Design a protein around this ligand. Structure first.
Ligand SMILES: Nc1ncnc2c1ncn2[C@@H]1O[C@H](COP(=O)(O)OP(=O)(O)OP(=O)(O)O)[C@@H](O)[C@H]1O
Ligand SMILES: Nc1ncnc2c1ncn2[C@@H]1O[C@H](COP(=O)(O)OP(=O)(O)O)[C@@H](O)[C@H]1O
Ligand SMILES: [Mg+2]
Lengths: 520, 91, 519
């Protein structure tokens, strides 16, 4: 009898909607007609416990001050301008409309850029409750929709678990690795605003209002999300960090946090700026800051051991003795070729974990019925087709430019892209292959500091390619003084920061007949 | 232990790889460090199973519980030639 | 009854105390026979099983921990240094802490045993479970009570058996993961997700921030990339004959002798017997087979002792075959003197370092262009490396000896012995080029020279991985000259002084240097 009062008192502070209150009180009336030891009494007890524990109408008191939220956001993360602007716009709209609101954001980018951490900081800044929901590897819809009450065990799904735990109708839910899901059709109902407001669970049998829930999904690659699921979400890109930004992050965030984790003090172990620059340049190459965090933690651990063991009362880390802490630099070579022989042309690629430089090497297989081209280097199908197109266009160009030059139409040429272990694909190297073949045929090296990228068609037209930011960064790192890009990537190149492109004599082209003039 | 009226019985378990938590129970039964404190669902007083001798047989060694393979010694039994089987059949 | 008293010695968090109270009351009002009674009983069994807030008293004395680590294991400088740093950091923090270490290397080098030694030194409880055959999230994250025969994964079992909030958990042979458990491991290994690890069966979250995780694997390549970003890679080295003998004498013979119940008075194993066991009977990078041989010989010695055939046994090389049979691997290398067509190369696999030979011959006699047939279960990458090597060998021969028509006309068959073992990797490019050029010129290479390193199309030698294991294997195979890419210098000199004592080492940037060295 007292359990009825226990269930009733939970609804005093709540504002229970009509369609939920009818279910609640009909189960209340039903419960009185059942003996305690019956199993139906047990299932009704569980159902009443679940219904009365949902925070009907409970909203966390959000803070709508732009200044305070901005101060909180800069306090935790560096340079994630897009996400911060999105959150400021969210707060502005919430303040203007005078009520809380829900949205479906998707932060996608390379690992280690701080998506989960920025989501936690957003939850802290908005004064909303926070909850992790790991969908990576999930395969059964029961995690989201639950089972019917009839079964011996029953779940109201993970979303109702979140609602019970956070005690609010408007939490911040982190749905990570949506691109590594097994299944997905249950998520459509969860985050479709036309039916999100009436999300129905198979255990509760009553729809809850999730329109105020702020869903923040995180992913690493965007194409793997199913198209219907990708349509309902706002894709927000979190970009990789340049060396300058990584240095700023390490100086401001990574080093103090690692010191706190290791228990050190600034007066005990000081880490110089040039040491951080050396660690970033030579000891780790990635878009994120995970490896840099490991290096900083290793340095601070070595410092802590030296302090505790009595080796020294204080330690100073300098580039002279950094090897004593983190060993020899793992990345020390900058370019494969300092002075390119005639048959090789420098190229750029949008590799994983940032762009990287590739070279295209060509050499004769046989001395002196037509010729043939052999391509090696774990090239993909698209890159093999690009090689074939490049070979045909090089033949056609040399037919009309130097008619007496019989080299390409009869010679047997082997084309190789070094570092054969790493798979390579994409039509980005269309013009690089043409330049390599033409330089081999003419027996003349290209400009010694020239780099290029761009897809080539059969008639010589240069088509745009992706990853201009990464390729530009790679060209800047390797010491390229002149870069060739397709003309339709002009806005992509000029959208970059001033400190990234100042040293490059950039050339924008529409056809290969002028890339030929630039390279020679 | 009752029907064999002994304190140190010799127990053979056959086809240890065809098992389906009974596996954890047999794992702890194979641990001499706890066999002196064996207790079941029926008896509320522990029984010291330290003195027992355990032999296990299976057709293959890839038994589903991983911690079985490091606790049992691999002894391989080999086939018989025709003369060997002839003598065995005759005897 | 007894379920309430078990929580009195622990520090139960509220978010699980309320849950266990409600479930216990529900069981108290429910009947004593229904199936839901059984489900509630099991759920509160694992609710009350795990030791809420019961830490283990760690020792923070650097000297005693260092002494224990040095006593238990030979070598392993990196692991001991890491543990010393761990203890110093724990001292500075003034409280217990937990990191995620990972040990990778060839099997049988002592990765698992050093974890037990660390646990003994840190006074933490120890538990080991493998994830090599893991194929679903369920067996690590648990099954929900709804499904028939649900279990609380393995980590909850770890906590209940170890009776400790900060034990040492060893995850073994992680390099093999089925088709997704990797996401579950990432959920388990994330330092931020450690504090609120939520099992499917035990709904209440548990605090795994204080546990120490050790990861065992053979190769880091196959470990999933997201998992590698979470764990710290530490390499465990192979052993040379000297280290193998030292380890055997100090640990393997005494431990196995005690296991057989004998003592030093009854069964003595001479150092010569151990050297013969290491050199001949056990061709491996670890001590997995040497331990088995020692156990076998000590077991047979004990059997001889019991029967009265001898009151004591002295194992000597003369009577060793009466204990461990006839020798195996009686020849160090398949080619003691290399004919003109073959060049010795170095290999690195999951089982440690190894040595391979590249063989070439004419398919049909000389008098249209040449061709290269490649056999030996070579992978796609190694086939492309062979094609590149053939092209560069042709180019180099057309300029070093322009009159030589051998490579452009003759049909060459390229073979790598052990045709059953699959092989892959571009690191054999320079070996293939040297083999082709030696066949073309008819001149054998230096009789004890070994080489490794990727070769590009223009002849530039690119760096390769696994220099340490390759050097160990080359030293084992009794070479005196080794050729490595110049970019591997930073990795070669990290070896111990006695490892690289007799090796005449050459570091090269372009193949012309290797051609000068070999001929
Ligand atoms: N701008 C930044 N300022 C400060 N710290 C940062 C910044 N970006 C990333 N970090 C730090 O880098 C680490 C990245 O961790 P986190 O889990 O947030 O990364 P992630 O890219 O979201 O991960 P995943 O893709 O695996 O989910 C954290 O320690 C975080 O604090
Ligand atoms: N450096 C060492 N010092 C002492 N014993 C060792 C060493 N390396 C290997 N061993 C012995 O080898 C045996 C098998 O090692 P094991 O734990 O199987 O290695 P892994 O886990 O890498 O396979 C252990 O019992 C251990 O005593
Ligand atoms: Mg994430």
């Amino acid at each position: 009898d007292a359990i009825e009062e226990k269930f009733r008192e939970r609804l005093k502070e709540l504002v229970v909607p009509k369609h939920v209150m009818d279910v609640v009180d009909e189960e209340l009336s039903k419960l009185g007609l059942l003996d305690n030891h019956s199993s139906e009494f047990n299932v009704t007890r569980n159902y009443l416990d679940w219904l009365t524990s949902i925070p009907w109408g409970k909203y966390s008191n959000e803070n709508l001050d732009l200044a305070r939220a901005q101060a909180v956001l800069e306090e935790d993360h560096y340079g994630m301008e897009d996400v911060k602007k999105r959150i400021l716009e969210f707060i502005a709209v919430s303040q203007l409309r005078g009520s809380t609101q829900g949205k479906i954001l998707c932060f996608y980018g390379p690992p280690g850029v701080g998506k989960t951490s920025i989501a936690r900081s957003i939850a802290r800044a908005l004064n909303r409750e926070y909850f992790r929901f790991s969908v990576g590897g999930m395969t059964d819809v029961a995690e989201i929709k639950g089972h019917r009450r009839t079964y011996v065990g029953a779940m109201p799904g993970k979303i109702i678990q979140c609602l019970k735990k956070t005690k609010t109708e408007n939490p911040l839910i982190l749905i990570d690795e949506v691109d590594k899901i097994g299944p997905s059709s249950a998520l459509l109902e969860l985050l479709d605003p036309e039916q999100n407001a009436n999300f129905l669970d198979h255990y509760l049998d009553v729809p809850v209002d999730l329109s105020k829930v702020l869903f923040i999904c995180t992913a690493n690659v965007t194409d793997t999300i199913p198209e219907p699921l990708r349509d309902r979400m706002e894709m927000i890109n979190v970009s990789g960090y340049v060396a300058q930004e990584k240095l700023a992050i390490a100086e401001r965030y990574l080093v103090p946090q690692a010191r706190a984790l290791c228990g050190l003090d600034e007066s005990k172990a000081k880490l110089s700026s040039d040491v951080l620059t050396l660690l970033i340049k030579q000891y780790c190459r990635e878009s994120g800051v995970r490896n840099l965090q490991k290096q900083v933690e290793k340095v601070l651990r070595k410092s802590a051991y030296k302090i505790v063991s009595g080796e020294a009362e204080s330690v100073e880390v300098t580039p002279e003795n950094l090897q004593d802490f983190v060993g020899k630099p793992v990345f020390t070579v900058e370019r494969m070729y300092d002075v390119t022989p005639p048959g090789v042309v420098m190229g750029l690629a949008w590799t994983a974990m940032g762009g990287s430089t590739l070279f295209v090497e060509t050499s004769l297989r046989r001395p002196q019925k037509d010729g043939s081209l052999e391509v090696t280097g774990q090239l993909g199908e698209v890159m093999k087709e690009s090689a074939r197109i490049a070979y045909t266009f090089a033949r056609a160009f040399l037919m009309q430019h130097a008619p007496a030059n019989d080299y390409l139409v009869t010679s047997h040429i082997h084309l190789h892209v070094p570092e054969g272990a790493t798979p390579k694909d994409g039509p980005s190297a269309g013009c690089t292959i043409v330049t390599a073949l033409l330089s081999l045929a003419m027996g003349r090296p290209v400009r010694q500091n020239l780099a290029m990228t761009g897809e080539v068609s059969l008639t010589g037209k240069i088509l745009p390619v992706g990853g201009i930011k990464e390729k530009t960064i790679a060209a800047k790192r390797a010491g390229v003084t002149c870069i060739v890009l397709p003309a339709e990537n002009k806005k992509d190149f000029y959208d970059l920061a001033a400190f990234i492109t100042e040293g490059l004599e950039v050339h924008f082209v529409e056809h290969y007949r002028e890339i030929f003039d630039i390279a020679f | 232990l009752k029907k064999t009226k002994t304190e140190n019985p010799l127990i053979l378990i056959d086809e240890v790889d065809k098992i389906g938590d009974p596996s954890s129970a047999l794992l702890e039964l194979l641990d001499p460090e706890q066999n002196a404190n064996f207790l079941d669902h029926y008896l509320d007083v522990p029984v010291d199973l330290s003195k027992v001798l355990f032999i296990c047989t299976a057709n293959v060694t890839d038994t589903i519980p991983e911690p079985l393979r490091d606790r049992m010694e691999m002894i391989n039994v080999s086939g018989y030639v025709a003369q060997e089987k002839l003598a065995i059949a005759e005897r």
